[PDB]
Design a protein around this nucleic acid. Sequence first.
DNA 1: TAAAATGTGATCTAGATCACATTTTAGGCAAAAAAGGCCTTGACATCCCACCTCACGTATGCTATAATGTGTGCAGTCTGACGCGGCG
Length: 75
Amino acid sequence: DPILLRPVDDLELTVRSANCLKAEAIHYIGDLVQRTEVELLKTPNLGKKSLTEIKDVLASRGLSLGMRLENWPPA
DNA sequence: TAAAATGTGATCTAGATCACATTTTAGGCAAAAAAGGCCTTGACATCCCACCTCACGTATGCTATAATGTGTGCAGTCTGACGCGGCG
């Protein structure tokens, strides 16, 4: 999709969550959605609420978590 | 009357029982500490400011044989009515 290929700062993320993302080598939103929730919760600084509001904003702009890709990355 | 429903009963078969010890694990209550929010510090980078700053540019002065009344390239004349100043 045209929205697979965006950096996450178009979502206007937060500093703690941003540190969580850059800390975990998660580059593309296609790389985001291929990651699973429990693969996030165990990670540093990602407990209750990061998952809450990131779930909110992805509920806003029409996508969800944990989805599955194929032919990734086209780069 | 064709075609589906109805008795033989002994031999079995996957789950329930049933009192009590031990985990766990919440969930939710107290919180340690870390990472934003708050500020600071040092260090850099880029300046704004202006403060100068010399070359090039510019405002001004004389030049002693002598020379002395324009014109100068145009217009082509439209015309009928109305004011006004001479014009007798």
